[PDB]
């Protein structure tokens, strides 16, 4: 089959995403969105950071981890059936192509 994340209506969803700062003392921008990762950026952006902190936020969506140390995992509060679908987590790594793109499947029961 294929990896997926699961939650009942009402609960919080927990979607993982990670990087390891192989060049420490330096962070990269990140963004979550709805829909599979397109060629550039993420889909309907819901949460984004610059190279320092969150510069775009949506009600119900939160970075729950130490994102400055590579935990870019996402909490979604009080989920509904509408929240089912694919989410894109994206790390802006400097270089040609580079960008780490992660599609995470959420299934709401």
């Amino acid at each position: 089959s294929e990896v997926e994340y699961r939650a009942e209506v009402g609960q919080n969803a927990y979607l993982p995403c990670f990087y390891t700062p192989a060049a420490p003392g330096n962070l990269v921008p990140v963004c979550w969105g709805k829909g599979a990762c397109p060629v550039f950026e993420c889909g309907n952006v819901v949460l984004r950071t610059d190279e320092r902190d969150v510069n775009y936020w949506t009600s119900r969506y939160w970075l729950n981890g130490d994102f400055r140390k590579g935990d870019v995992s996402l909490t979604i509060e009080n989920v509904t059936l509408a929240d089912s679908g694919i989410y894109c987590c994206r790390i802006q790594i400097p270089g040609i192509m580079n960008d780490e793109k992660f599609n995470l499947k959420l299934v709401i029961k």
Partner: antibody, heavy 122, light 109 residues
Framework: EVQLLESGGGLVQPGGSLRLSCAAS????????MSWVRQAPGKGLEWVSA????????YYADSVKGRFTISRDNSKNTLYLQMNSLRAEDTAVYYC???????????????WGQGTLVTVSS | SYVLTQPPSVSVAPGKTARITCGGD??????VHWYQQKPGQAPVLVIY???DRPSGIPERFSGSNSGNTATLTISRVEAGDEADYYC???????????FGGGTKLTVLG
């Protein structure tokens, strides 16, 4: 400008209860995790309790579990701390604090209030 | 379980550089933040995420973090910089916000 004003501090006897309040302004209150931090006279800072933007999650230092309840009314831009079974060593200045935008926990104490003295004595 | 350690006191001559240690097990792995508290006043956020500087804080304030030591650095020390300085972390293992014991900065001469 961000503003955090504590009220409700004062005198109370060992075993007694008290309710602190923190009126917030100058930002969307619901969008930010809130904490309480305290400091006994001459002592260090000690984190007490925190609550998520929505109120969905609450967190407590061990030394106050079972006694203190943190809560919030987002339609009144107000944070609360219900303090029961108060003890001598709970005597301190109580500071309200706000965390950072888009973080579930808050992560750090970006903005502080001026605090409110709670004294627990017979 | 996770604990932060600071030296109680640090002295420095005016115009020099003050260094305030914050010790913890692989503290490099966690975001460290720094508070200034002048006698009688509420704490002020001086540095966040190791080395970021809040709007309106002088550039003489810098921070670092790697290994077992995080370090707040204050150059060209002036007398107003006397205070207690606390380091701070978020431990998502126990869901506690932790503080170091504090460091008294004293300006000599």
């Amino acid at each position: 400008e961000v503003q955090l004003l504590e009220s409700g501090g004062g005198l109370v006897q060992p075993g007694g209860s008290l309710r602190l309040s923190c009126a917030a302004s100058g930002f969307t209150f619901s969008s930010y995790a809130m904490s309480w931090v305290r400091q006994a006279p001459g002592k260090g800072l000690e984190w007490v309790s925190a609550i998520s933007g929505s109120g969905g999650s609450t967190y407590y230092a061990d030394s106050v579990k079972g006694r203190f309840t943190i809560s919030r009314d987002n339609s009144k831009n107000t944070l609360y701390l219900q303090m029961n079974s108060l003890r001598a060593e709970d005597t301190a200045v109580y500071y309200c604090a706000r965390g950072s935008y888009g973080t579930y926990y808050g992560n750090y104490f970006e903005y502080w209030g001026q605090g409110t003295l709670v004294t627990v004595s017979s | 379980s996770y604990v932060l350690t600071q030296p109680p006191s640090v002295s420095v001559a005016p115009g020099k550089t003050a260094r305030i240690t914050c010790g913890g097990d692989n503290i490099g792995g966690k975001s460290v933040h720094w508070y200034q508290q002048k006698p009688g006043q509420a704490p002020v956020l001086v540095i966040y995420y190791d080395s970021d500087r809040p709007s309106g804080i002088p550039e003489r304030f810098s921070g670092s973090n790697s290994g077992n030591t995080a370090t707040l650095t204050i150059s060209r020390v002036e007398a107003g910089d006397e205070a207690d300085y606390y380091c701070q972390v978020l431990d998502r293992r126990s869901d506690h916000w932790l503080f170091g014991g504090g460091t008294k900065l004293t300006v000599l001469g």
